[PDB]
Design an enzyme around this catalytic site. Structure first.
Site, PDB file in Angstrom:
ATOM      1  N   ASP A 207     231.544  10.727  17.341  1.00  0.00           N
ATOM      2  CA  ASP A 207     230.430  11.172  16.525  1.00  0.00           C
ATOM      3  C   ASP A 207     230.944  11.870  15.268  1.00  0.00           C
ATOM      4  OD1 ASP A 207     227.893  11.680  15.669  1.00  0.00           O
ATOM      5  OD2 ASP A 207     227.245  12.732  17.482  1.00  0.00           O
TER       6      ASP A 207
HETATM    7  C1  LIG Z   1     225.925  33.049  14.597  1.00  0.00           C
HETATM    8  C2  LIG Z   1     225.598  31.910  13.626  1.00  0.00           C
HETATM    9  C3  LIG Z   1     224.092  31.606  13.447  1.00  0.00           C
HETATM   10  C4  LIG Z   1     223.503  30.589  14.463  1.00  0.00           C
HETATM   11  C5  LIG Z   1     222.095  30.011  14.116  1.00  0.00           C
HETATM   12  C6  LIG Z   1     222.077  28.576  13.493  1.00  0.00           C
HETATM   13  C7  LIG Z   1     221.038  27.566  14.088  1.00  0.00           C
HETATM   14  C8  LIG Z   1     221.262  26.056  13.732  1.00  0.00           C
HETATM   15  C9  LIG Z   1     220.932  24.994  14.843  1.00  0.00           C
HETATM   16  C10 LIG Z   1     219.542  24.292  14.709  1.00  0.00           C
HETATM   17  C11 LIG Z   1     219.507  22.757  14.975  1.00  0.00           C
HETATM   18  C12 LIG Z   1     219.507  21.862  13.727  1.00  0.00           C
HETATM   19  O1  LIG Z   1     220.527  21.480  13.226  1.00  0.00           O
HETATM   20  S1  LIG Z   1     217.905  21.354  12.976  1.00  0.00           S
HETATM   21  C13 LIG Z   1     217.654  19.491  12.983  1.00  0.00           C
HETATM   22  C14 LIG Z   1     217.734  18.844  11.571  1.00  0.00           C
HETATM   23  N1  LIG Z   1     217.545  17.376  11.527  1.00  0.00           N
HETATM   24  C15 LIG Z   1     218.287  16.424  12.251  1.00  0.00           C
HETATM   25  O2  LIG Z   1     219.192  16.807  12.998  1.00  0.00           O
HETATM   26  C16 LIG Z   1     217.954  14.936  12.090  1.00  0.00           C
HETATM   27  C17 LIG Z   1     219.092  13.935  12.428  1.00  0.00           C
HETATM   28  N2  LIG Z   1     220.400  14.593  12.519  1.00  0.00           N
HETATM   29  C18 LIG Z   1     221.574  14.002  12.022  1.00  0.00           C
HETATM   30  O3  LIG Z   1     221.442  12.897  11.503  1.00  0.00           O
HETATM   31  C19 LIG Z   1     222.954  14.729  12.118  1.00  0.00           C
HETATM   32  O4  LIG Z   1     223.623  14.255  10.994  1.00  0.00           O
HETATM   33  C20 LIG Z   1     223.811  14.379  13.361  1.00  0.00           C
HETATM   34  C21 LIG Z   1     223.288  13.136  14.050  1.00  0.00           C
HETATM   35  C22 LIG Z   1     223.771  15.565  14.300  1.00  0.00           C
HETATM   36  C23 LIG Z   1     225.323  14.092  12.941  1.00  0.00           C
HETATM   37  O5  LIG Z   1     225.382  12.967  12.242  1.00  0.00           O
HETATM   38  P1  LIG Z   1     226.810  11.830  12.389  1.00  0.00           P
HETATM   39  O6  LIG Z   1     226.197  10.793  13.288  1.00  0.00           O
HETATM   40  O7  LIG Z   1     227.024  11.441  10.945  1.00  0.00           O
HETATM   41  O8  LIG Z   1     227.857  12.734  13.002  1.00  0.00           O
END
Ligand SMILES: CCCCCCCCCCCC(=O)SCCNC(=O)CCNC(=O)[C@H](O)C(C)(C)COP(=O)(O)O
Ligand SMILES: CCCCCCCCCCCCCCCCCC(=O)OC[C@H](COP(=O)([O-])OCC(O)COP(=O)([O-])OC[C@@H](COC(=O)CCCCCCCCCCCCCCCCC)OC(=O)CCCCCCCCCCCCCCCCC)OC(=O)CCCCCCCCCCCCCCCCC
Ligand SMILES: CCCCCCCCCCCCCCCCC[C@@H](O)O[C@H](CO[C@H](O)CCCCCCCCCCCCCCC)COP(=O)(O)OCC[N+](C)(C)C
Ligand SMILES: CCCCCCCC/C=C\CCCCCCCC(=O)OC[C@H](COP(=O)(O)OCCN)OC(=O)CCCCCCC/C=C\CCCCCCCC
Ligand SMILES: CCCCCCCC/C=C\CCCCCCCC(=O)O[C@H](COC(=O)CCCCCCC/C=C/CCCCCCCC)COP(=O)(O)OCCN
Lengths: 459, 175, 178, 124, 63, 88, 219, 55, 70, 104, 84, 128
Positions: free
Chosen positions: F43
């Site tokens: 990934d």
């Molecule tokens: C102590 C520090 C603070 C902690 C708090 C921080 C909280 C953040 C966590 C919240 C969750 C989110 O990310 S919010 C969600 C936002 N939207 C999406 O995730 C839509 C699709 N995601 C993707 O396409 C990504 O790229 C992915 C497939 C993962 C990789 O891609 P590869 O296939 O190219 O690796």
């Protein structure tokens, strides 16, 4: 006193009868010898003066200024040798002639036993320096600079002439000895107020006083290097010398007529110092530092105490040497970069380490670092002002802060950091420039060992 | 030292304790001072002897200058420039000598403070008192004149002070 | 540092940058390796359930809310590598980096020592002088009309050619010249 | 601490102001009033030039302590009887100050008791 | 050998000059070098006078 | 300092050593030219964790713009070589 | 004014040091707190005790920066304590010298810091002063012990947290001798100096038992 | 460090200025030492000139 | 000036017996000094004189009279 | 200029500027040696309230401690020779009023 | 003359989660249905001389035993010498 | 739900907290493309002048020239007397002068009255 005047005049035929490739050598060597002769004048005495003749006289206030004036000419020749290389022989001789005439008028102004002769030579100096600025200057603003440097000066100085002749019609003499011995108090009157203003304003313009200083940044920035050196080192001190001489007929009026000026200085020295913190030009920053130091000298002269006068003499000598050195360093950078913008050429300590140490020592003397004579003058003036009023310290104190700040700013912007990548014409420092730097700075650290030589007649 | 007059710069007879060791443990200070003497003072003393005999081989003298008394500013006519000149020069010389007198008293005070140690606040009352006297006299003579001081200004200051004194004395007598 | 930047960041780039920032600041928070590894796996999972979120409005509401969350719990004194921009030795050796052209101003007595170095240097200068004339023409012929659109440089395509504008990339002073 | 607790929370007048003690005559207790003694005179105590804050009633022991320290220099633990003597004398001086404070407090308490009792009698 | 020559050129020579400068030039003028007077305790004798400071007042010695 | 002058061989050995300790990749399969996205079925998050592992191994930090386009162990080794200037 | 300035300075700098992650920053804030303690001593009119504290603090704080720099150099210019793990055995001499310096800083009895800091607390307790400045002085002493604990625990006791290529090396005679000279200082200099200087203030001979023990209890 | 001789010279300069500060008998000498230690602190803090944060 | 110590790469670094014995010796000397000073000078932390009690002192000692004297 | 990207390859890496880009009117205010406006973990107003609150509190409590000093249950020190009259100022020609201390 | 001895990397199969707090992390993580992919990358921090830890009080008492022994010997020698 | 971060002049809004970068629109993409195109043109010109072996001087920057010219020489020709300019000039150029004048005049009048009264204790005030 003719043993110095005559050789300086003889410098002219020797320059005009020299071979086309021997003018600089002969001028430098002979001028240096004349400077050596000037040292004899220093052996001043605790009583009245060295009254050489009816025309000229020397004093422990005039002697350090005379020695500095004679010493400045070889350095100006060394600094001018570089940028005048592609210049015709007749015009190079004309430039050296302007410098020699300027020195001749300056030497004469100090002995100048009578006030009308002093005024005549004090204004005679205005012609060679104007020619130097408006002929051998690079930018197109030089013309404006010249005009400013002219009219400001004359605007302050024509009333003085009137006042002077008026005094000779009432007292009968303008000889300084007779004036000092036959002095009488000044009554509180409107006519006396205006005679005080006419006496003061001429010298207050050339210091320059804050608010009347607009001519200085122009005339210093668009002048050639020799012009800048002579303007900052000596020509600014003519006002201080004249104030020290003429305030003997202005008492007890000065006891309250000095209030508008003191304020303009005590606040002004702050304002111009802050101006140095936001400056995009080295020459402009050095000019504003000159304004601040002369504001302090103005405060010292207006307080009229023995410590004020000693501090003012010391500070005038120290500022002349330090500001000449700073202008010479800025010009060494300029002749390589051709820009005169402080932010452009950076990280020069990596490329020119000896220029870097010269910059450091110049900034430390501008810093007023003990036990330099800059500190001696600063401290005497500050102590005298504290005795005059305990609140002045705040202003004085804060001024010192700002001074150090911008001084080190000037050292950090140009010498430290990372070198500018695209500038590849930073050639090694010439022996001429290092010799110029050493010949500025060694007299300062040699004078710090014998302060009574530059502490004036009230020592 | 015969170089300076003891009476002008007085010094106490300098009473010092005698070494009275209580333990037989040999202290390092005495050994250190003996080796310092042997290794430092003797060569310096020999060099000084040589230099002093060379100086004695060539003896010549210099004199302290004597200045005659001259009529002062009070017995001088209003515009008589020569008498004003000489009175002014004499007044300036007297001003310098007064400065030197105050310097002498201040050196006395400083030396007393350093010498008397912890009991300086009591054992230096005499020098403080004489310095207070000299300081009051000097302040009366020469303060407030300004950068352009002269004999005439000192005379005018003295005249107003004695006018105030005469007024005070007349008021107190007729009180 | 090396690669030319793009006109903007896509959603995946922003998500990955948030993932890096969160992991680094969590490591700065939970210091020990086992504690960090556990909470980092939890961070991966809590980062992971919305991997498949399809429509972009929910995914943008998501990662904006997450962005706010990061600011609150970041660790106002994060760990920084010593050579990184906020590090304690970021520009420590930057004052020792002297340009190569300064070598041209050495005295001939200085160049008397190090003769092999200066022979190789002259060879390099000749190479640069010829390559520059070739490379101006190459970069003029490849650039699209209206000027370049991105800060990307075409590679050398012929046998004796060198990549355009190579002199100031290969002649870097060093990482630690001393 | 408890004296600060008593003064700054309870009745201030029941406890002394430390700046102004004593508020009562030395003879208020008993007429004997044996005077304090000094062994160190003016001249030798001045010549020892101790310190202005050290010129107290324990001066003699400190004089002997410094003399013995000067005499037995290299063995700088040879003076333990002298330092203990001076330190115990300073302990006695502090305890006498404790007793002065406590005497003032009890004198103050009786005075307050006397006025209230007298006041009660006046009201009766 | 290095330490012996070094202690001559860097310790011995400067102390020679300074001792000469202090003994024969600086102390030639009054009050240039001033020393706090040595402490006097009861029972010491003085080199210059030879007398003995009288002892103390024999306080009651117990504990 | 007293630090060894690391070489290309050391960088490659250490990169592969870190990769082998990533249990999500079988050690017996990975090679110097093995792509992460396809040859190892990784990934993007796995790639960025791998970048973190390399950074923590070598003591310095690759910027995001340069890190997000590093897809081969040989590619990572060459980037580290460019940063540390280890020609041999 | 001097007493209040010293009290607020020592409190605030201890409170800032209590949570820092740079080792040099923590030791610098330790220096700032000790300077605040010095001016507290000035405010209660005990200048000689402040001078003695200056002399003792010189030894142990200089040797503490000695140890910190040894760690930083051996860890390849790493100054953050989050990447410092098990160094108690990896660097034995740095560990022992840092422990000795930290005990001297916190006023371990009969050590260099004892003979100055102990009497400073003694005198600030037995003087007519602010209650609040006394409270802040005691809290600052507690916080001093606390960040000394922080450095020792979090940079010497756990498992290693630094990069895999280990370059730890103490075996340099220059470093070892320079450390051990200041070690001998930090162990014996307070005793020697206190027993060789003449008495120049009155002592706090008699005191409540709990007040005499206050510094040790707070540490 | 390439400039270790300079570094040592700088350290020595600071020691001299501090000795001047400590042994000073009047206020002018003490000010000389006061400003000397400050300037040498400025020169030694900004030892690495090329680092902006040091300046 | 020292000896030759080679890197280990994820192992405990080599230690010379000299540094171990020197560290152990200096720690032992520190603890011996603490114990020795505590033994010979125990009052330096404990005190040498008991703290007197204000309540214990008698009225006669403090010269206090319960409104009898005046 | 401090909050510009530290990883972009500027033409002026120290100042973080590119050749030809327009220069801010106050560049010399913002040069990484001077005032920087980088966002902080805490908001500006919260920091101001907290900093002011801590300082105000310490001032108040220092004044309170001046109102309520701390001391030991002791009397003043007793000094023998007329409260050390002669060794503090002197004036031995005045015969001051004798003051004597009470033994207990 | 520097440290050029051709250091070799150890076997990469040496590192195991067993017997380390990484095992506890693994247990807690699998209790929620997850696994740490980088556990063995860190095992070297618990393997060699880093396996045994020292307590804070144990750290402070680094040389108490020999100091105590020397103190006992010294006090015994003083006791024997004084009573004579 | 977490406390909100409130930006200020000296603590600006972080890029990742800007709602503008999440309000994604196509004209934003064309604007970004145009900006980066201008930047790339400028970088190309600079690097073409920078790598040229024939160049042996300073690469003159019109942006720097414009900055310095605007800061120094463009001020007065673009000045106009407005209520803001007039009031600020009067305040900042007059008020400090008269404030300091009042302060020093009051201090010196108090000093002179005390001296005339004789109750100032100028003992040892010799040098002035
Ligand atoms: C102590 C520090 C603070 C902690 C708090 C921080 C909280 C953040 C966590 C919240 C969750 C989110 O990310 S919010 C969600 C936002 N939207 C999406 O995730 C839509 C699709 N995601 C993707 O396409 C990504 O790229 C992915 C497939 C993962 C990789 O891609 P590869 O296939 O190219 O690796
Ligand atoms: C302090 C005691 C000194 C005793 C020994 C004798 C000292 C002689 C000093 C001579 C005067 C300075 C000469 C300046 C030109 C130097 C040119 C040069 O490059 O040298 C080549 C040589 C080799 O250089 P290189 O490798 O070829 O070049 C490398 C690069 O240039 C890179 O260069 P760099 O990075 O090496 O920079 C050079 C270095 C040094 O270079 C300098 O900056 C020189 C100028 C520094 C001061 C700047 C002016 C500030 C005002 C001070 C006024 C003091 C006047 C003293 C008398 C001066 C008479 C000329 O930088 C500094 O050290 C900054 C010093 C800041 C001084 C702060 C304290 C000053 C006041 C001290 C108290 C003095 C009075 C005390 C009274 C009571 C006690 C006595 O380097 C030197 O020799 C440096 C000299 C050491 C610095 C002396 C500074 C202290 C002494 C001040 C004057 C003498 C005081 C005597 C009483 C002391 C007690
Ligand atoms: C721009 C940068 C600086 C430029 C130069 C500035 C310095 C020049 C300022 C001149 C100094 C003071 C001028 C007059 C001083 C006299 C004292 C006066 O100010 O105080 C009162 C004077 O009263 C009133 O002020 C009358 C004057 C009011 C009208 C005059 C205009 C005042 C401000 C104008 C300044 C303009 C500066 C630029 C002009 C070209 C005292 O009243 P009174 O005790 O009863 O009379 C005393 C005088 N006697 C005894 C001779 C009769
Ligand atoms: C009075 C001072 C008046 C204000 C002076 C303004 C000076 C402006 C010119 C300074 C030049 C610009 C500058 O210094 O840059 C800011 C510079 C760098 O910031 P860093 O935190 O290091 O950032 C590092 C990471 N980037 O920081 C500074 O040094 C500015 C410091 C200004 C301090 C002003 C506050 C001082 C107030 C003191 C009041 C208390 C007095 C003490 C009480 C004494 C009681 C006896
Ligand atoms: C840097 C630019 C400054 C421009 C010049 C500023 C200087 C202004 C000083 C006054 C100028 C003229 C002074 C006269 C010279 C002295 C002669 C004198 O004192 O004689 C007076 C004469 O006094 C005057 O005539 C003064 C009139 C002034 C006329 C010109 C006005 C100039 C401007 C006035 C307002 C501002 C003045 C100061 C401005 C300061 C600079 C901004 C009295 O003599 P009698 O009349 O014979 O005796 C009294 C019994 N009959």
């Amino acid at each position: 006193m003719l043993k110095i005047i005559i050789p300086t005049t003889m410098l002219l035929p020797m320059t005009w009868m020299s071979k086309h490739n021997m003018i600089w050598i002969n001028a430098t060597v002979h001028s240096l010898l004349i400077s050596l002769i000037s040292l004899s004048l220093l052996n001043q005495l605790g009583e009245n003066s060295l009254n050489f003749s009816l025309t000229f006289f020397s004093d422990s206030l005039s002697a350090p200024l005379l020695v500095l004036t004679t010493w400045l000419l070889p350095l100006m020749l060394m600094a001018s040798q570089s940028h005048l290389s592609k210049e015709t022989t007749t015009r190079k001789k004309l430039y050296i002639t302007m410098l020699i005439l300027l020195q001749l008028f300056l030497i004469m102004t100090f002995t100048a036993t009578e006030l009308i002769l002093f005024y005549i030579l004090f204004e005679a100096t205005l012609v060679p320096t104007l020619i130097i600025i408006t002929r051998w200057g690079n930018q197109t603003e030089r013309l404006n600079a010249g005009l400013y440097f002219l009219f400001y000066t004359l605007a302050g100085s024509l009333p003085l002439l009137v006042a002077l002749v008026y005094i000779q019609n009432t007292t009968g003499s303008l000889n300084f000895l007779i004036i000092h011995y036959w002095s009488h108090p000044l009554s509180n009157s409107w006519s006396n107020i205006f005679m005080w203003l006419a006496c003061i304003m001429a010298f207050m313009v050339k210091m320059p006083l804050y608010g009347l200083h607009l001519w200085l940044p122009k005339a210093h920035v668009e002048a050639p290097i020799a012009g800048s050196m002579v303007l900052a080192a000596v020509l600014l001190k003519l006002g201080g010398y004249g104030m020290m001489r003429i305030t003997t007929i202005l008492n007890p009026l000065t006891n309250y007529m000095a209030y508008p000026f003191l304020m303009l200085s005590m606040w002004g020295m702050i304002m111009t110092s802050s101006i140095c913190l936001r400056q995009t030009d080295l020459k402009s920053l050095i000019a504003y530092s000159s304004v601040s130091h002369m504001a302090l000298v103005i405060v010292a002269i207006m307080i009229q105490t023995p410590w004020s006068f000693m501090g003012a003499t010391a500070l005038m000598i120290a500022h002349g040497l330090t500001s000449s050195m700073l202008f010479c360093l800025a010009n060494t950078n300029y002749e390589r970069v051709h820009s005169r913008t402080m932010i452009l050429a950076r990280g020069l300590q990596t490329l020119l380490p000896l220029m870097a140490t010269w910059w450091l020592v110049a900034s430390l003397t501008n810093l007023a670092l003990p036990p330099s004579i800059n500190l001696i003058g600063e401290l005497f003036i500050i102590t005298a002002s504290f005795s005059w009023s305990n609140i002045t310290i705040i202003l004085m104190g804060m001024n010192m802060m700002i001074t150090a700040l911008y001084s080190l700013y000037m050292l950090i912007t140009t010498q430290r950091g990372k070198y500018t990548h695209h500038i590849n014409n930073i050639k090694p420092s010439f022996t001429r420039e290092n010799a110029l730097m050493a010949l500025h700075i060694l007299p300062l650290l040699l004078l710090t060992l014998n302060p009574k030589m530059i502490l004036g007649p009230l020592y | 030292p015969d170089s300076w007059d003891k009476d002008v710069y007085p010094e106490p007879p300098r009473r010092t304790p005698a070494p009275a060791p209580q333990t037989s443990l040999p202290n390092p200070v005495t050994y250190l001072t003996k080796i310092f003497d042997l290794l430092v003072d003797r060569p310096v003393t020999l060099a000084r002897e040589f230099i002093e005999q060379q100086h004695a081989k060539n003896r010549y003298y210099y004199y302290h200058r004597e200045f005659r008394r001259v009529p002062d500013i009070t017995e001088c006519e209003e515009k008589d420039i020569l008498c004003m000149f000489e009175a002014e020069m004499q007044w300036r010389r007297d001003y310098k000598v007064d400065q030197e007198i105050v310097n002498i008293i201040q050196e006395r005070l400083k030396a007393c403070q350093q010498r008397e140690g912890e009991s300086y606040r009591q054992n230096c009352a005499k020098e403080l008192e004489q310095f207070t006297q000299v300081s009051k006299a000097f302040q009366d003579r020469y303060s407030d004149l300004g950068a352009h001081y002269s004999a005439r200004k000192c005379l005018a200051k003295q005249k107003q002070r004695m006018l105030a004194e005469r007024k005070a004395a007349k008021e107190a007598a007729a009180a | 540092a090396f690669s030319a930047p793009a006109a903007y960041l896509t959603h995946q780039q922003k998500v990955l940058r948030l993932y890096k920032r969160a992991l680094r600041h969590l490591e700065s928070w939970c210091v020990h390796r086992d504690k960090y590894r556990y909470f980092a796996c939890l961070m991966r999972a809590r980062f992971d359930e919305h991997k498949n979120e399809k429509d972009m409005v929910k995914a943008t509401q998501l990662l904006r809310q997450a962005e706010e969350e990061f600011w609150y719990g970041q660790h106002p004194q994060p760990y920084i590598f010593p050579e990184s921009p906020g590090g304690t030795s970021y520009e420590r050796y930057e004052c020792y980096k002297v340009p190569e052209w300064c070598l041209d101003d050495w005295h001939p007595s200085e160049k008397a020592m190090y003769p092999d170095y200066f022979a190789k240097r002259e060879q390099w200068k000749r190479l640069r002088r010829e390559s520059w004339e070739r490379e101006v023409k190459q970069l003029q012929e490849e650039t699209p009309p209206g000027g370049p659109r991105t800060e990307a440089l075409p590679p050398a395509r012929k046998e004796g050619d060198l990549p355009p504008l190579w002199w100031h990339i290969v002649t870097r002073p060093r990482e630690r010249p001393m | 601490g408890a004296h600060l607790a008593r003064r700054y929370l309870g009745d201030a007048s029941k406890e002394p102001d430390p700046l102004r003690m004593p508020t009562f005559p030395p003879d208020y207790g008993f007429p004997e009033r044996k005077e304090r003694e000094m062994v160190a005179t003016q001249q030798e105590m001045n010549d020892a030039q101790l310190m202005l804050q050290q010129r107290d009633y324990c001066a003699h022991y400190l004089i002997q302590l410094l003399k013995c320290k000067r005499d037995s220099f290299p063995n700088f633990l040879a003076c333990k009887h002298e330092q203990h003597d001076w330190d115990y004398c300073e302990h006695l001086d502090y305890v006498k100050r404790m007793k002065e404070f406590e005497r003032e407090r009890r004198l103050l308490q009786r005075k307050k008791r006397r006025e209230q009792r007298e006041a009660e009698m006046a009201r009766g | 050998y290095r330490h012996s020559i070094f202690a001559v050129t860097h310790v011995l020579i400067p102390v020679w000059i300074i001792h000469y400068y202090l003994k024969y030039h600086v102390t030639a003028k009054p009050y240039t070098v001033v020393e706090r007077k040595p402490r006097i305790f009861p029972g010491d004798t003085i080199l210059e006078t030879g007398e003995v400071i009288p002892l103390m007042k024999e306080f009651p010695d117990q504990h | 300092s007293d630090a060894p002058p690391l070489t290309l061989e050391a960088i490659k050995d250490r990169v592969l050593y870190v990769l082998k300790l990533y249990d999500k990749i079988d050690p017996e399969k990975l090679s110097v030219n093995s792509h992460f996205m396809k040859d190892l079925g990784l990934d993007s998050l796995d790639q960025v964790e791998i970048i973190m592992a390399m950074e923590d191994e070598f003591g310095f930090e690759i910027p995001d713009i340069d890190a997000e386009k590093l897809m081969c162990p040989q590619e990572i080794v060459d980037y580290i070589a460019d940063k540390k200037d280890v020609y041999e | 004014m001097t007493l209040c300035l010293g009290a607020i300075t020592t409190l605030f700098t201890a409170l800032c040091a209590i949570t820092q992650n740079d080792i040099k920053k923590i030791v610098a804030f330790s220096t700032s707190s000790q300077l605040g303690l010095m001016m507290v001593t000035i405010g209660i009119n005990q200048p000689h005790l402040a001078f003695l504290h200056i002399c003792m603090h010189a030894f142990f704080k200089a040797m503490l920066f000695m140890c910190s720099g040894s760690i930083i150099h051996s860890l390849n210019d790493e100054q953050d304590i989050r990447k410092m793990g098990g160094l108690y055995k990896a660097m034995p001499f740095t560990t022992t010298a840092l422990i000795i310096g930290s005990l001297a800083l916190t006023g371990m009895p009969y050590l260099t810091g004892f003979y100055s800091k102990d009497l400073i607390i003694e005198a600030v307790n037995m003087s007519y002063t602010n209650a609040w400045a006394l409270l802040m002085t005691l809290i600052a002493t507690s916080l001093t012990a606390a960040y000394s604990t922080r450095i020792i625990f979090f940079a010497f006791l756990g498992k290693p947290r630094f990069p895999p290529l280990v370059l730890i090396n103490e075996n340099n005679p220059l470093l070892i001798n320079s450390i051990k000279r200041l070690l001998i200082g930090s162990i014996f200099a307070g005793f020697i100096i206190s027993n060789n200087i003449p008495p120049m203030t009155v002592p706090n001979t008699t005191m409540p038992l709990y007040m005499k023990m206050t510094a040790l209890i707070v540490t | 460090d390439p400039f270790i001789n300079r570094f040592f010279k700088y350290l020595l300069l600071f020691l001299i200025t501090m000795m001047i500060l400590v042994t000073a008998n009047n206020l002018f000498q003490l000010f000389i030492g006061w400003e000397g230690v400050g300037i040498m602190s400025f020169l030694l803090i900004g030892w690495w000139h090329g680092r902006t944060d040091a300046n | 000036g020292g000896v030759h110590i080679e890197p280990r790469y994820r192992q405990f670094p080599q230690l010379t017996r000299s540094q171990l014995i020197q560290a152990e010796f200096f720690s032992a000397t520190m603890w011996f000094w603490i114990l020795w000073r505590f033994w010979h000078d125990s009052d330096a932390v404990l005190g040498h004189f008991p703290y007197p009690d204000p309540s214990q002192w008698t009225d006669e000692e403090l010269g206090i009279l319960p409104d009898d004297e005046d | 200029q401090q909050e510009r990207d530290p990883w972009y390859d500027w033409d002026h890496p120290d100042l973080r500027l590119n050749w030809g880009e327009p220069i801010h009117w106050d560049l010399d205010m913002y040069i990484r040696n001077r005032v920087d406006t980088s966002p902080t973990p805490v908001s500006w107003n919260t920091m101001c309230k907290h900093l002011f609150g801590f300082v105000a509190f310490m001032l108040f409590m220092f004044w309170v401690g001046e109102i309520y000093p701390s001391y030991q249950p002791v009397g003043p020190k007793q000094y023998p020779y007329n409260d050390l009259y002669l060794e503090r100022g002197g004036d031995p020609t005045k015969e001051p009023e004798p003051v004597v201390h009470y033994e207990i | 003359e520097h440290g050029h001895s051709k250091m070799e990397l150890p076997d990469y199969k040496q590192w195991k989660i067993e017997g380390t707090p990484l095992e506890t992390v693994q247990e807690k993580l699998a209790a929620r249905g997850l696994r740490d992919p980088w556990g063995r990358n860190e095992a070297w921090r618990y393997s060699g001389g880093f396996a045994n830890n020292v307590s804070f009080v144990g750290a402070l008492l680094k040389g108490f035993k020999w100091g105590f022994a020397a103190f006992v010997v010294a006090v015994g020698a003083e006791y024997y010498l004084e009573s004579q | 739900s977490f406390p909100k971060y409130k930006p200020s002049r000296l603590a600006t809004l972080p890029a990742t907290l800007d709602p503008a970068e999440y309000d994604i629109s196509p004209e934003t993409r064309k604007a970004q493309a145009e900006r980066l195109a201008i930047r790339s043109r400028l970088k190309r010109e600079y690097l073409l002048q920078y790598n040229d072996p024939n160049r042996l001087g300073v690469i003159e920057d019109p942006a720097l020239i414009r900055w310095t010219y605007a800061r120094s020489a463009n001020i007065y020709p673009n000045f106009r007397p407005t209520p803001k300019t007039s009031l600020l000039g009067a305040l900042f150029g007059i008020g400090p002068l008269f404030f300091w004048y009042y302060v020093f005049k009051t201090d010196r009048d108090k000093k002179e009255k005390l001296i005339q009264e004789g109750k100032l204790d100028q003992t040892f005030n010799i040098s002035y």
